Each structure stands twice: as structure tokens, then as C-alpha cells.
Design a protein around this ligand. Structure first.
Ligand code: HEM
Ligand code: HEM
Ligand code: NA
Ligand code: NA
Lengths: 717, 717
């Protein structure tokens, strides 16, 4: 190899290829954002005329452009696919992907083989973006264009929430390790898909439309469809509803040989102005378009909602055939239905066709029972598709407080992890001071109160904005039993004690003030930090914002919450089994999901160690002589050249720190020592370990702690 | 190949290896910075107690630590090498490197082979960092410890300025293409060293101490010494003084086989706490130390300043021998001077020894005249070494306003590109208004005024902070003759007219107010921009900070300024010959040197195009019908899918943009079209090209313009 200039991507990872990349903690830096620090998308979206916007998108949909002529004179179905692909990268394992950042317009997603032609689709929406400007994000517009397409073609949707803020550089996400587009190095066993991945090959949305590994066996395709859609949060009813709903519209494109299609947009020359897949087959567009290489028109009304998809699926028998580009697809046997399927540019009629993955809906016995019913009950298909589409387009939006504008329906939905509305007045200063005292007199320790509040709050992830302390779900399944949370039972003592305090305060309170369990979990941590800070010679106040409410078990989907269980949390020195990478990488990944900067991660780790937040109160990294005192001791001792560190002879992922006596003075994990070893982290440690640093550390610690407590608090911002 | 998690370095660069890397415009992002937003290092260090600092460094220097015992009981010489290496990465071609940012403490420099053992040196200084905290940067401390070491051992320095601001992530710099440490792929012709490099091998500071590619020929080593030092701004006298003054102290380290030395710091395990090169030879340290693998002690007084180096160099005859580790060095012939050189830990005395590169100073005939003169007149050496050492450790400091504290000498130095002190009252609001009017009435066009101001101001580079509009050098050599500034002599007309306005203003002025030519150059741009924005319907005031002064030609080192000449300036659509990369890369590189973000670079390109700032007023990228009007037409037209772009038939770096008829409506360069093609830049173009975006564009353009006009204005910060 050769090293490149930095402007062509050269840097330190070339010389140390497996090095920790702290850039995941400064994604989307403010200086790359053109809008400026006062920009307030919620205030701008509030201003939009949604009816006019809807009419502007209908005009785009029926006005054919000569650089990509509209099949059947309507871009609606292309826009449904656009919207479906935008939301269709979502994965449950880490909550990454999905439409909430408009990441389809950036690398790598803008150039995935499965997003071929979406470069033209998005481009078609520039006239609408141009007219609304800062009032409308690309993120909102891409999925709103699909929703408007559904409605303009006869399908009434359940609603729509605006509010996705545009970003200015791509979210960098692990999409798999294959270095060849459409490569597959992600299966083992009989058919176990590598976590956290939710598609079958690199650069596909879910499955291969010619069947697993290009082999068109619809039964085997079904296995893939069911698993990838599960990992995108869809069950069997949702998955069938979505496939039938989508393929009610439009057509594939495979008019000619794919080797006449040129490079994807990130690799295409400048004069293409950000478009890719430039084709030399015929005109390269429209009648001659090549996108997937399959050539299927599913229904006899590609620009109308009706039940034709299932009528065709079940009204014909099917046989394998090949598309003009050499892909497997299915056609009706016996020459049936000849001429019945309309051409997108006024050519002659054609025969019924289907994808291998569409036959899956008839071959797989579970999907077969679901879709056979819809054959006779289209009203149920319509109901299921409206619910699954809404979920699809909003799955990564987070708490319903964030959904903006006039089309949000009011019905609660279990998948939104709903919390109750506030029903009483909220605690004010006096009531908060009082409850801080009760908590401090309750016999719960600093370590118990801080660990419990951290376990509640740090369950949030900023990818899909699920989790956090609102809801009080630490006392419900499954969080109440997660290993990191409740190692040996002590969690239930804390829960019971805080419940006793809620009960007494609520029995006696001023008027109509009541406090939730969820709020006391957080308030106990804050009170404990005030106590630890005193212990250390600081009179401080830890901010606290009331307003959390208490969800019930029935409002808490246990299976859905399973993906939020930490398998690693370096903030508590917890490392479970099954992580993809060593502990220091998992720490940064955890810090990234909590939206923490590197300074924020650093102070939190140092403060939580000395407060006793560790899992099972282990002494790893607890570099202090003081009990329950909030000092910068972690930083000071980490930097002390008087300590000689070595891996423990147990080979148990721990290290021993010996003083000059040769006595083991401290012990630590990889997560602990990385702050002393990594040159950029150790630079931060040196800020907090200096002699003048103690007030700064407390201030920064409290701010970072307050951030984590408020992560899910979109109800009050 | 395999794709990696982002936390392990994975990203879009893996799929498109040569993609333009926009991360070079958001380096050292605020979110990675642990210090306050209000944090002002200059304010902090300005209050430091320098005498106390000096005493504390002196105590570190004479207190041996067990994990790296001090040679001769004094770490001074090690610290001198440390400071010399911190400053010694500097290079004139781009101004990158040098000690100004404390980059030695981060990758890759902390792990360069030439920087072996300075991991320990920097670690020795943590007690001082700890004590002074935010009042003392690592960047200042590393070079200040070298300066104190010199004074501690009897050499009076010229002075010292504090104020180097710590950074939190490494500067990412092109250090060469070699992908092996000590690799050499950087020579062509007879011995032409690749620009912008200033070292003979990857990971060396300047030259190979065993001679060119390890051949210990002193005469040929002298060719490399002279050229690498020249590329670090040092002539023959300065180079000889630096080498002699440096090797007056301390010793090399090569006690044992180098294959017993473990991985460099960035590759070492966690338990070494950021140290590297752990050695299993004997104790690994002190008397068994292994750093370069050479074992040379130059003088009989390694912890004292005197004329021993040159007395030894000239008082013996030398013959080639091998160190314990097998490296080439020189030792006195015929057993002369046996036992005269003291051991670092009290062992037996040893014989005189020199590096091949030290013999260069005696064998090369230029150096021999210089150094024989110093053998005979040693007080001349002390004066040249003071001057040269001061220059070395301050070369990248920028304007002398940045130098802070009580050690800063008063004397003016040519290499500081000095400007006169302000000597009259400055123009205030009324005078600034009146001059704007007189400039707009002078007959000079908007294009001429914007071009001239841009030329003067955009010569600043934020690497070594040289250049900028202060000094009025646009009218002196060499700036007045640079091809990009003055293609066909139109600059001189502007200059004459602005001098006429200066002289008539000053001879009429109220009171003691006078204005400089340098201010009028910038003020003229500002007035042209107000005029152009009014033509487009905006009434805006362009900010303007007076106080630049006018240097004379005698105060302007013509050769030193040669390196500031642009060979590319995309903001003017100028591409000279000889650039290392295609024009869009050179554009972002110029933006990085201007300290611009991606939004700022974007608005400036689009504004400058329509203002007529292009070199030779070519129409490339001038996507407007209006003359001299500050509109957002660049962005609107770039996004016009009614234009079809193709490389021009002449293979000449340009494109033709044809409209519906097939007539050529626009032409543009690679720099113009990258904004339409690159997915991240096109996002920004889409902000500024929306129907609502004209006011925001004018405002952001004006703020970006102001930024560039004030780049070198450290006198008001
Ligand atoms: C097992 C899951 C799925 C598979 C294998 C699949 C496969 C495909 C393929 C290969 C294409 C053709 C692309 C081209 O050549 O132009 C296509 C188009 C389309 N997909 Fe699906 N799809 C799936 C699910 C969905 C879902 C869930 C939706 C929406 C809810 C959807 C909506 C569409 C639409 C409307 C089109 C037509 C696009 C146009 O008319 O230009 N698909 N799909
Ligand atoms: C042609 C240029 C130079 C070459 C090839 C060179 C080479 C070397 C080498 C190989 C070492 C041994 C490192 C080790 O094994 O510990 C060394 C040490 C040293 N260098 Fe030079 N050097 C050069 C210029 C300079 C300059 C300009 C200075 C300061 C102004 C300097 C100051 C020192 C000092 C003080 C030491 C001794 C460090 C100690 O005692 O630990 N050198 N140099
Ligand atoms: Na239909
Ligand atoms: Na000496």
C-alpha cells in the first residue's frame, strides 16, 4: 500500500488499523451544519401549509420529466419505493438506520445496489424542497412523498408526523463486513444471520428478490423475509401487509443487460451532478429502464389501490422464467391472463408476473393463511397495511411528543412505548427539596441511588430514540431482570423503598401534586450526587426536571424491549458475553448511543467509578480512598506514574496496579485503563486530573449526568 | 479486505477510496474540546508565574525517576531533544508541523521512530502540567522545558513567548506516501525531494543519522542536511549553529540489540499507559537505554554549555565503527582521548565519538568554514545558536501579537514578517463611511475591488499563521507579481488608485486620524460588496476592523514569501501547474488553510463567482445573468436539471452546460461542478439555492468574507 493525503482520506488509522475511532463521538459537528445554532426546525415546520405541500407533491407526481420519464405517467409508485427504502434500513439490534435522518441522500445509502434509481426519485423532489426551503427537511419530504403517493392513488393512510431534522454528514453505521457489493459473509449454522444486521447481503434492504443467494425457492425466501422483517420490528401480519401493499403499485425494471449500467452515484463522474447508474441500453430510462434487472408488473392497475395483487397471486399458477436481463421471476402457467397487464408507456399488454418473494406469500403456510383471508377481506388488508406503513415510516421517531403537525392521529400505539399523560400538578421546588431529604434519609446508599438512576436513564439510545427513564420501566419486565441491572437482587430493595416514598408523599401532598415512581428514580440519583459532592467539600445542586410518568406492564412490550438490554456498559464496568468487539470499543459505542461527547464520556466514567456505580460494586477502576465522595480521584490516580500496571495472572480481563512496595494498590478493566493508554483519552484525563480541576470536574460531571437523565425528555423540549 | 465497524475506523472511504474528504474542514471540533466555550488560553497563560514555572521545571530536570533514570542526573538534554523534535516537524511548503499545537503528544508523531523515548520525556513533565493546569498548555510546556534546560545548563537564550493553544485531536497531515516506517519513496531526478516533505524518510525529523540511506558518508549526508533544513526555514549558518548547540548536550542511546525494543506507543498494550518501545535489554532504561541504536556521547561535558563539541570535532581524526546495537558512528583514531568522555551512570570513561552527520559539519566545505570560524571565535556560536534556537521554536507562532509573557523580547525580526506599530488614531465610523464612498466613486469596478481584497487576505494560511492582508504586501514583491494575483497588470491600477485615496484622505484628515494602504485594500472589498448587495436588493453593511499597517519592501523577505504563493485557488477558479491532486482536492485544502468550514467555503465560492473575482475574469462557474450583483444564482443554476453537463470536447479541464435547445448556456470547471456532484456539498448548495435563501446567503457570505479579511488580525484578538 501507500499513504494518501488527508483530503483524500489519509490518516492515523492507516498506520494503526484497529485503533479506537473517537470520531463516532463527534458525528454531525455543529461547524458542518449550515443552518446555525439558533436554527429551530420545530418552529419552522409548524408554519407549513400541509395542504399546499400535498398539492405540490401531487403535481410533481403527475408531471413527467424527460431525464426519467414516469411509468404510467405517475411517479407515485417510485416514491412509495423510495419511502419504503428510506425507512427500510432500520434494525432493532442497535436502532440504527431508518428514515429519521434522511440518510438515503448520503453515502453509502445513496449508492447501495438496492437503491438504484432512487437517485432520480429524490432528484424529482427538488422543486418541492426548493419552494419550502428551511420549513421542510429532506428527511420529512422523502417519507411524506411516499405517504402522499399512497393517498393520491386511493389508499387512505393512518396519519403522518413531521419533525425529522436534516443532518449534514452521513451517519456511519456498520452494515456488515463484506467488501463486495451484494457480498454475503454473514451467515452461519443452518441460517443464522450475523447480529446486528437485518438484510441478507451487503447493500440490500431486506432479502434478495430472486431468493436466497439468487436461487428462487419461495419457501426458502420466506425464511429470509420473516427473519429480516422481524429484525426491522415487523411480525407476520405486518410483513405480509407491507409486501402486498407495496406491490399493489408500480413495477420493477430490467429491460436490458445490467452490464450496460454505469457506476453508482458516489463513483460516477462530476457531469452527472450526483446521479448514478447511467445506462447505455437504448434511451437508458423509461421504456428501457434497468433498476433491479427483474421485469415484473404485479397488478393490472399499477397506479391504483385495489385487491388485484392477491387476486392475481391466487388466481394463477406460476412457473419460473427469466427477465430480459437474466433474473429469475415467475409468470402465469398455461399462457393464462395473456395481455391483461398494462404497459408503462403504452406498449401492448403483457402476462401476469411475480417475484419469487411474492410467491413466498402463497407458499409459506403462515403467510398463506394470512393472505388467503385478505383475498376475501380487502378491508382487513387495508387496515393492516395502514397500521404497518405508519409504523414503518415512524419507527425511529422516538417518543410521540416529537411527532409534529396536523396529521398526527391521537390513538396510542403499543410499539411507541407509550407513557401516560401527566394527570396531576407536578412537584415544585419545595416538594423537590422535601423528597431529596426523604430519599437521603431512607437508608439507600449513594451507590444504590446512582446505579439505579443510571440503569434507568442509560437504557436510552439516540439511534431510534427508544429507552430512557420516562415510563419508570426499570421496575417492569424486562428491565427489572436484566443482568447488568439486578445482579443479585438489590434492585428490588431500591424499588420497594422508592415506592414507599412515592406512596407517603402522595398521601400527604400539597393539593393535587403527585410524584411518579419514574421521577423518584431519577431524583434519587440527583440527591445522592448532591450528598457525594458535600462529602467532597462542595455545596452543589443537581438539576432535576419532573414530569416523567409511570407506564404499566401492559403498556410495555417485553419482546420489543429485549433489544435495549445492554450486553456491555463500560460506565458500570459491565461486560457480558457476545459482544462484537473488545470492551473499550463497546464503551465508545455505548457513549455514541447515549449521544455523549468524549469529554462527557470521560467525566461520567470517572464520576461513576468513585460514586460506586459499578456492576456488583466491583473495585475495578474505583481509584479512590474515599467512600461515596465525588472527587476527581479517578483521573489523578490513573495518571500516577507511581503505579505499575500489569495484566492479572488470572487472565480474567483485569489488570493489577502495584505501588513501589510491590503491593497491589488498584485493579482495573480494559475500560478503565484505556483512559490512561489511548493518547486522546489520556489528554482528557489530564484536564480533569490537574490540581486546579476539581470544581470543573464537578460542574462538568453534573452537566453530563443531567444530560443523560433528560435524554428521552422530548415532552419538555 | 473486510469492512470494519465505525468505532474501529470503518466508513465510506472504504467503498470509495479516493473520495474527497470533507473532515479536513471540521478538525478539532468544539464538541471534542473539554474546555469551556468561553475558554481563552491567552488569558490564562498571561497570568502564569514564569519564575515559579522555571523553578518547577528545574526540579523535574534534576529529580531522576526510576522508570526512566536521568543520564548524568539531568533530564535537560533529553528535554532539549524533545523541544527540537516538537518544533522540528515544521516545513515551509505548507507551513504544517512545528510545535505550535503540541502535536507531538498525539498520533502519528508520538510514535515516529525518530521520536522514540520522548514518550518518557513528555511523561516526566506531567507533575508540571498537573501543577499549572489550564494556565499552561502541553504545547508551550514541551518547548519551554527545552528552553529552561538550555538556561539551566549555562546557555542564555534570546527569550520565549507563550500562547500555543492545546488541541484535542491530532492535526492530520500528509507526511509522505510510504506505508513502512523509515520507508523512502520520495526522491526523483538526481536527488529532488518530493514537495511538501522536509525529511528524507518516513518518520524521521530531518536526515538519517547514519547518512543517506544508512551509508555513513559525511559529505553526502551534508547535502541532505542542507536541503531538509532549508525546507524548515534554516540556512547554512543557522543549521550549523543548531546542530552544534544541540550536540553540545547529552548523548544517544544504543546499548543493546534494537530487536529487543517493543512496539511504539500507539501499538503498545494498555498496561504501558501510553508509553512505547518497552525494552527487554537489561533493565530497559538508563544505562541499558536504547533509543536510536547509536551510542555516541559528543562532549566531555554533556550537561554544560561550552565549546567542547567543536574542539572535539576538530581535535581528533575520525574512523568508522559500530555501536553496541550495530549502527554506524565515528570514533577517534589511534585510541586518542581514551577515557576522556564521562559515563551517564558513573561507569568508566569512554572515547570520543561523533555521528556521520556531525562529521558533515567538518567535511562539507560551507559548513567547515562556518564551524572552523566558531572553533576560533566561540562567542559567535553562542549568538547564532540563540537566534536560531529562538526562530526554531517560534517559527510557526504567527504574528508577534500572539507571543505572550515577560520573556518576549522587544526586537523586530525579519523572519516574523513584521508590520509597523500603529502610530496614529484609527478611522472611526464616519471616516470608514466616507472612505467606502470615495472608493465606490474611484472608478474601480466591483470585480477589481473584491479580487484585490481576496488576493491580499487569502494569502494567510492557518498552519503557521503566515500571510494575510495586514502589512499591505499585495503591492510589494513577490505578491504583486504572483500569477494568480496579477495576470495582466490590472492589479497595479487598483493599487495606484487606492494609494491616491490614501494620500488625499491622510492629508485632509480630521485630527490625528490616518489610514493605511493595507486597510484600504480590505475596505475596498467591503464597499464593493455593499454595492453589489444593493444591486441585488439587500442593504447590508459589511463589517470592517481597521488597524492594519503597511510594511516596507525591506521588511518583506521575498524568498520566505515564495512559499505563500498559491498554485491553486478554487475561490478564484485558478489552477496552476504542479499540484499534487485534482482541483477539487486542492480547493478543500485551500479551505483548510483558510480555516473555513464546508458551509463557509460553499458560500464564498458562490458569492465570489457572481462578484467577478475569477482569475482573468473567466466565465467558468459564473452561473448568473446579472453583473456585479450579490445573488445566490450560482446555487440556483447549479441545481437546474434543465442543464445537461458534459466534459468539453477540448480536453481542457472544463465542462459545457447545455439547455433544452442544445445551446451551451454555461461553462464550468471541476471546482464548479464538484458542488453539484459531491453528495455532501450538494446538500449545502440546496440550502443556499432554495427560494427562501437569498437573505441567508448574503448574510453567511458576508460573515465568511469578514472571517477571511480578519484571519491574520491577532493584534485585535
Ligand atoms: C420481501 C420484501 C420486498 C422485496 C424482495 C421487494 C423487491 C422489490 C424489487 C426487486 C423491486 C424492483 C425495483 C426496480 O427494478 O425498479 C421493487 C419495487 C417496488 N417495491 Fe418492493 N420489495 C419488497 C417489499 C416492499 C415493500 C414493503 C414496499 C412498500 C410498502 C414495496 C414497494 C415497492 C414498490 C411500490 C415498488 C415499485 C417501484 C416502481 O414502481 O418504480 N416493496 N420491490
Ligand atoms: C542533522 C541533524 C541531526 C541529527 C541527524 C540528529 C540526530 C540525533 C540522534 C540520533 C540522537 C540520539 C537519540 C537517542 O538515541 O537518544 C540525537 C540526540 C540529541 N539531539 Fe540531535 N540530531 C540532529 C540535530 C539536532 C538539533 C538541531 C538539536 C537541538 C538544537 C539536537 C539536539 C539533540 C540533543 C540535545 C540530543 C541528546 C538527547 C539526550 O541526551 O537524551 N539535535 N540527535
Ligand atoms: Na394496483
Ligand atoms: Na557540553
Amino acid at each position: 500500500g501507500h499513504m494518501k493525503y488527508p483530503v483524500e482520506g489519509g490518516g492515523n488509522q492507516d498506520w494503526w488499523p484497529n485503533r479506537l475511532n473517537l470520531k463516532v463521538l463527534h458525528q454531525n459537528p455543529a461547524v458542518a451544519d449550515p443552518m446555525g445554532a439558533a436554527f429551530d426546525y420545530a418552529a419552522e415546520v409548524a408554519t407549513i401549509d400541509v395542504d399546499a405541500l400535498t398539492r405540490d407533491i401531487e403535481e410533481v407526481m403527475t408531471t413527467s420529466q424527460p431525464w426519467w420519464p414516469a411509468d404510467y405517467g405517475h411517479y407515485g409508485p417510485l416514491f412509495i419505493r423510495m419511502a419504503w427504502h428510506a425507512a427500510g434500513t432500520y434494525r432493532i439490534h442497535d436502532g440504527r438506520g431508518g428514515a429519521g435522518g434522511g440518510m438515503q441522500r448520503f453515502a453509502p445509502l445513496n449508492s447501495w445496489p438496492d437503491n438504484a434509481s432512487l437517485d432520480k426519485a429524490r432528484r424529482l423532489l427538488w422543486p418541492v424542497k426548493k419552494k419550502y426551503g428551511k420549513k421542510l427537511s429532506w428527511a420529512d419530504l422523502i417519507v411524506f412523498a411516499g405517504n402522499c403517493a399512497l393517498e393520491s392513488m386511493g389508499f387512505k393512510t393512518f396519519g403522518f408526523g413531521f419533525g425529522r431534522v436534516d443532518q449534514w454528514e452521513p451517519d456511519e453505521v456498520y452494515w456488515g463486513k463484506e467488501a463486495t457489493w451484494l457480498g454475503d459473509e454473514r451467515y452461519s449454522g443452518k441460517r443464522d444471520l450475523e447480529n446486528p444486521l437485518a438484510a441478507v447481503q451487503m447493500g440490500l434492504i431486506y432479502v434478495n428478490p430472486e431468493g436466497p443467494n439468487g436461487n428462487p425457492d419461495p419457501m426458502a425466501a420466506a425464511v429470509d423475509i420473516r427473519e429480516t422483517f422481524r429484525r426491522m420490528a415487523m411480525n407476520d401480519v405486518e410483513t405480509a401487509a407491507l409486501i402486498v401493499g407495496g406491490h399493489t403499485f408500480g413495477k420493477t425494471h430490467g429491460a436490458g443487460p445490467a452490464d450496460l449500467v454505469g457506476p453508482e452515484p458516489e463513483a460516477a463522474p462530476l457531469e452527472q451532478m450526483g446521479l448514478g447508474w447511467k445506462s447505455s441500453y437504448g434511451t437508458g430510462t423509461g421504456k428501457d429502464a434497468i433498476t433491479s434487472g427483474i421485469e415484473v408488473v404485479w397488478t393490472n392497475t399499477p397506479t391504483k389501490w385495489d385487491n388485484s395483487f392477491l387476486e392475481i397471486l391466487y388466481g394463477y399458477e406460476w412457473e419460473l422464467t427469466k427477465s430480459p436481463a437474466g433474473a429469475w421471476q415467475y409468470t402465469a402457467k398455461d399462457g393464462a391472463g395473456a395481455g391483461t397487464i398494462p404497459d408503462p408507456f403504452g406498449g401492448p399488454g403483457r402476462s401476469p408476473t411475480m417475484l419469487a418473494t411474492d410467491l413466498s406469500l402463497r407458499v409459506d403456510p403462515i403467510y398463506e393463511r394470512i393472505t388467503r383471508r385478505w383475498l376475501e377481506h380487502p378491508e382487513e388488508l387495508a387496515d393492516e397495511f395502514a397500521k404497518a406503513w405508519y409504523k414503518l415510516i415512524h419507527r425511529d421517531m422516538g417518543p410521540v411528543a416529537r411527532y409534529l403537525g396536523p396529521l398526527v392521529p391521537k390513538q396510542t400505539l403499543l410499539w411507541q412505548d407509550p407513557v401516560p399523560a401527566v394527570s396531576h400538578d407536578l412537584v415544585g421546588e419545595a416538594e423537590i427539596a422535601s423528597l431529596k431529604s426523604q430519599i437521603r434519609a431512607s437508608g439507600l446508599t449513594v451507590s444504590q441511588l446512582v446505579s439505579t438512576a443510571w440503569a434507568a436513564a442509560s437504557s436510552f439510545r439516540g439511534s431510534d430514540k427508544r429507552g430512557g427513564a420516562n415510563g419508570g420501566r426499570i421496575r417492569l419486565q424486562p428491565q427489572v431482570g436484566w443482568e447488568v441491572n439486578d445482579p443479585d437482587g438489590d434492585l428490588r430493595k431500591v424499588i420497594r423503598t422508592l415506592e414507599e416514598i412515592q406512596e407517603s408523599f402522595n398521601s400527604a401532598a400539597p393539593g393535587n401534586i403527585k410524584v411518579s415512581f419514574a421521577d423518584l428514580v431519577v431524583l434519587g440519583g440527583c440527591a445522592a450526587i448532591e450528598k457525594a459532592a458535600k462529602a467532597a467539600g462542595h455545596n452543589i445542586t443537581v438539576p432535576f426536571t419532573p414530569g416523567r410518568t409511570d407506564a404499566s406492564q401492559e403498556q410495555t412490550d417485553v419482546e420489543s424491549f429485549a433489544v435495549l438490554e445492554p450486553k456491555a456498559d463500560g460506565f458500570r464496568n459491565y461486560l457480558g458475553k457476545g459482544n462484537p468487539l473488545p470492551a473499550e470499543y463497546m464503551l465508545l459505542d455505548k457513549a455514541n448511543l447515549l449521544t455523549l461527547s468524549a469529554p462527557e464520556m470521560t467525566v461520567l466514567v470517572g464520576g461513576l467509578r468513585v460514586l460506586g456505580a459499578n456492576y456488583k460494586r466491583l473495585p475495578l477502576g474505583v481509584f479512590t480512598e474515599a467512600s461515596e465522595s465525588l472527587t476527581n480521584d479517578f483521573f489523578v490516580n490513573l495518571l500516577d506514574m507511581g503505579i505499575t500496571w500489569e495484566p492479572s495472572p488470572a487472565d480474567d480481563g483485569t489488570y493489577q496496579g502495584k505501588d513501589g512496595s510491590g503491593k497491589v494498590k488498584w485493579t482495573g478493566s480494559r475500560v478503565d485503563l484505556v483512559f490512561g493508554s489511548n493518547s486522546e483519552l489520556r489528554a482528557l484525563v489530564e484536564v480533569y486530573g490537574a490540581d486546579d480541576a476539581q470544581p470543573k470536574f464537578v460542574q462538568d460531571f453534573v452537566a453530563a449526568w443531567d444530560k443523560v437523565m433528560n435524554l428521552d425528555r422530548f415532552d419538555v423540549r
